[PDB]
Write a protein that binds this ligand. Structure first.
Ligand SMILES: Cc1ccc(C(=O)N2CCN(C(=O)NCC(F)(F)F)CC2)o1
Length: 119
């Protein structure tokens, strides 16, 4: 019933994500010299360094907000990919599975803790 615990739980999950080779393409912004069409296709860039910085700044109120930005990383990769069998998109799908597997308890515990707080 700790309604602050999500933040360190998210910090540790981001640490795991940064250790994971599959996160390489998603740790920083897209160079438009390398992908000149990227911002034609993608209105709202997002990367794991921006998510970590937002968390560390104290600019997420809940793990739901963090989860929305992480999911945007993945939806951006799905929108940008030229193919469902693109290397970087395939990395996104494995990393998304890993993230969803690990964030589910963080969201459950937060929402339970907040229901207890308001009981
Ligand atoms: C070919 C394909 C399919 C899907 C994606 C994709 O999701 N992108 C574009 C490449 N990208 C970076 O260029 N990331 C920056 C750095 F420094 F890590 F390279 C990550 C986002 O790209």
């Amino acid at each position: 019933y700790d309604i602050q615990a999500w933040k360190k739980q998210c910090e540790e999950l981001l640490n795991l994500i940064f250790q994971c080779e599959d996160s390489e393409p998603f740790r920083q912004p897209v160079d438009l010299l390398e992908y000149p069409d990227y911002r034609d296709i993608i209105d709202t860039p997002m990367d794991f360094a921006t998510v970590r910085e937002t968390l560390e700044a104290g600019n997420y109120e809940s793990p739901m907000e963090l989860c929305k930005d992480v999911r945007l990383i993945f939806s951006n990769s799905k929108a940008y990919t030229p193919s469902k069998r693109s290397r970087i998109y395939s990395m996104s799908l494995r990393l998304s599975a890993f993230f969803e597997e690990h964030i589910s308890s963080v969201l459950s515990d937060y929402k339970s803790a907040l229901r207890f707080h308001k009981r």
